[PDB]
Write an enzyme that holds these catalytic residues in place. Structure first.
Site, short mmCIF file in Angstrom:
data_model
loop_
_atom_site.label_atom_id
_atom_site.label_comp_id
_atom_site.label_asym_id
_atom_site.label_seq_id
_atom_site.Cartn_x
_atom_site.Cartn_y
_atom_site.Cartn_z
N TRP B 102 0.82 -1.21 0.00
CA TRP B 102 0.00 0.00 0.00
C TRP B 102 0.85 1.26 0.00
CZ3 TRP B 102 -4.46 -0.58 -1.82
CH2 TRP B 102 -5.19 -1.75 -1.59
N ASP B 171 -0.64 6.76 6.43
CA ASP B 171 -1.80 5.96 6.01
C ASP B 171 -2.11 4.98 7.13
OD1 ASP B 171 -3.71 4.31 4.88
OD2 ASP B 171 -2.53 3.81 3.10
N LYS B 195 -12.11 -0.64 7.18
CA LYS B 195 -11.23 -1.68 7.76
C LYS B 195 -11.50 -1.80 9.27
CE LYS B 195 -8.95 -1.89 3.58
NZ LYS B 195 -8.74 -1.01 2.43
#
Lengths: 365, 365
Positions: B102, B171, B195
């Protein structure tokens, strides 16, 4: 009893909200919520595929058009349209038709990505569509943009304009699937789902498949038509629940006769209100020229052309007492506004019609 | 009877799904669904303000920080962060730390908006965090970016790295509100809701109020921190239902001990699985160095380090018979991945613990 005349987000069919409720903990037996469902699962692939098929079916989308579901709303497309298309011709110019508040916002936003030219003279009031014969079109423009229905001022196109063969982009957020559409005439159609086709959180974008691959370098990947069409709107996590709700409204539209029935039902609804205004002897004034009157959003004033504030507050206060919500006009215009989208039933409009007549029968001098 | 180990979208507390179901048609007595609710109504203002207050409360966000709710997901911020911040300094440079898939995607996306320097050499395998003291930092870089928790590879920071005074962007999608966070050490924190704190469709962004007003011209308005912070996330229609769902999950986290309790619950869960792997005598292999092991996502292989295809299929097959969903590892890595987000209970993990122990007892050579 509540009658929801909301402008966007709007009312959803009662049958759809019932199904969402009963499936909320155990969607069709899989044992989880759609709110918990993976966007990569076989179950959601069936959801997003069926939602896309209904858009193609109900609107008769030709096979050379992609149908993708993005985030960011319509105002996102105010940036996604120039980012994806303004580089279509080297000049990076785009021609815009401004018929109200949302065409103006889109035209201003596009100035951040190229030279934007408004093709018609500035209008003193958003009450009519400038005759397409007056449009000063740039032959080197990368595209031509117009808004199908101005939600704040009630100005609507009942025709697809002649743009001399240029690529046509249309903002149909407030009248999407309220009538059949010749998709073949357009390069890009977009519409936020929160007015006629679902709940807030997802935007439908219909792009001709040869208009991909002109996106600027600065276009975010989640908003690039080419990237999202190649991943079937699953480049990143899509708004799963919004797409699930949208497919249910689309299914509701199809069971109720599709775009053809919505056009008939929206004619009966809007005519019921315009009939009260046109025979109100000046008690209700609707400033839009009759040949451009929107069938979705009917804004009007009470008393006179500028509006009598004392009478309008009494109207809204009594309207709220009758559980008719969101009848207040937009902040920038004031007055009254009735939104009659697909889920607003005729009985809902019949309640508004009966109230407007009794109010006129009690305050006309 | 379903045990949901989804990686994102993930499991929501059964308590939250019940309240969403009960009020789906008549939210708190106002007569309409949140799906029908206007973002300009007094009712939604209570929702989004309470949702913002809960983020500020649970994280202890200082007053000089804005809390905004955007669309576009985490990958949306992969473009919004450079668009909003890469122009802090005239060089348009940004330092990125790549510890997994990511942060790798975010570093590549940022190359569309400026010159991106990856601070450390390529790892060869995403099994550790490069030492921050060995980080090649650019003093003229606009910001330093890193991903706190890599969802695919299971590498999580248990510290805040020293970037020598640079604006720190993080992030935190896959570990947001799984532990307390010293927000003052960050310039920007963002996280997709799906999430750990809600459902897909909304992204929370925490921005220091002096970092607004550096956005590039090409930044879409709906993604500009300054524009959206100035309108309290209401520049256009926000994901109303997704913000509503998130507020209930945050209230659920608060009722269950806040971030401090989430941290210790996350320790019990991850320690239960990591010990099974560590005592598996090589039957289960987790390649991440123990000091960097994620407490949210535990990827491992069965049989040997490179993976026994036969055993891993039976594990996933028998796990499906026992209603343990989404345990298959990511497409890019294969193997098994168990996600242990906030709503995943200790009772859920014990079913995974018992099954992993029994599978080892039945196929270990």
């Amino acid at each position: 009893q509540v009658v929801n005349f909301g402008p966007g987000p709007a009312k959803l069919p009662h049958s759809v909200l019932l199904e969402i409720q009963k499936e909320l903990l155990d969607y069709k037996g899989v044992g989880i919520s759609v709110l918990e469902m993976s966007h990569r699962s076989s179950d959601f692939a069936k959801i997003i595929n069926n939602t896309e098929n209904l858009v193609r079916e109900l609107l008769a989308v030709p096979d050379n058009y992609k149908v993708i579901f993005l985030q960011g709303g319509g105002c996102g497309q105010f940036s996604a349209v120039p980012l994806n298309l303004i580089g279509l011709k080297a000049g990076r110019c785009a021609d815009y038709v401004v018929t109200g508040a949302w065409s103006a916002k889109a035209a201003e936003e596009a100035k951040k990505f190229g030279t934007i030219n408004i093709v018609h003279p500035k209008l003193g009031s958003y009450t009519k569509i400038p005759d397409p014969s007056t449009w000063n079109l740039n032959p080197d423009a990368s595209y031509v943009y117009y808004c199908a229905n101005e939600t704040v001022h009630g100005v609507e196109f009942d025709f697809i304009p002649d743009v001399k063969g240029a690529v046509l982009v249309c903002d149909m957020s407030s009248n999407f699937l309220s009538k059949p559409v010749d998709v073949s005439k357009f390069g890009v159609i977009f519409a936020g789902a929160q007015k006629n086709v679902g709940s807030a959180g997802v935007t439908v974008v219909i792009v001709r498949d040869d208009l991909l691959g002109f996106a600027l370098r600065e276009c975010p990947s989640v908003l690039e038509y080419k990237v999202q069409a190649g991943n079937s709107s699953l480049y990143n996590t899509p708004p799963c629940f919004s797409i699930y709700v949208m497919g249910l409204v689309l299914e509701w539209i199809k069971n109720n006769g599709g775009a053809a029935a919505m056009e008939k039902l929206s004619s009966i609804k809007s005519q019921t209100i315009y009939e009260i205004i046109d025979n109100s002897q000046g008690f209700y004034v609707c400033p839009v020229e009759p040949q451009n009157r929107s069938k979705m959003n009917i804004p009007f004033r009470i008393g006179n052309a500028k509006g009598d504030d004392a009478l309008e507050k009494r109207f809204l206060d009594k309207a709220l007492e009758l559980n008719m919500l969101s009848l207040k006009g937009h902040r920038s215009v004031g007055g009254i506004r009735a939104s009659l989208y697909n889920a607003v039933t005729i009985e809902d409009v019949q309640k508004l019609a009966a109230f407007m007549k009794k109010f006129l029968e009690m305050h006309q001098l």
